[PDB]
Structure 1
Amino acid sequence: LVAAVGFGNTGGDIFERGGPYLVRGAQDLLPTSALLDEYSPALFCTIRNYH
């Protein structure tokens, strides 16, 4: 029970500080993820040619 008190307090603090950040980051990553997926085929060949 004491360990649960300590771990719950620490984890709740960390989650309350870094939850909305992660939520909005994962919300804003949709266009960048779609863009990276759309132009994936020109990645390996581009890096190979530059090398």
Structure 2
Amino acid sequence: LVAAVGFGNTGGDIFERGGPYLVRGAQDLLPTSALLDEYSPALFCTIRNYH
């Protein structure tokens, strides 16, 4: 019970401070994720040719 008190309080404070940030970051990552997925084939050959 005491360990649960400590763990719950610590995790709760962590999530309260760093939950909105993760949520809005994963919201704003959708367009750039699609962008990087669309230009997949232009990556391996580009790196090889620059190398």
Structures share fold, TM-score greater than 0.5: yes
Cα separation, 2, equivalents of 1:40 and 1:17: 35
**TM-score, length basis structure 1:** 0.99
CA deviation string 1:6-50 (max 9, x = no partner): 000000000000000000000000000000000010000000000
**CA distance in 1 between partners of 2:40 and 2:18 (Å):** 31
1:2, CA displacement in angstroms?
Answer: 0.2
Matches within 5 A, 1:9-24: 9-24=9-24
TM-score by length of 2: 0.99
Paired residues, number: 51
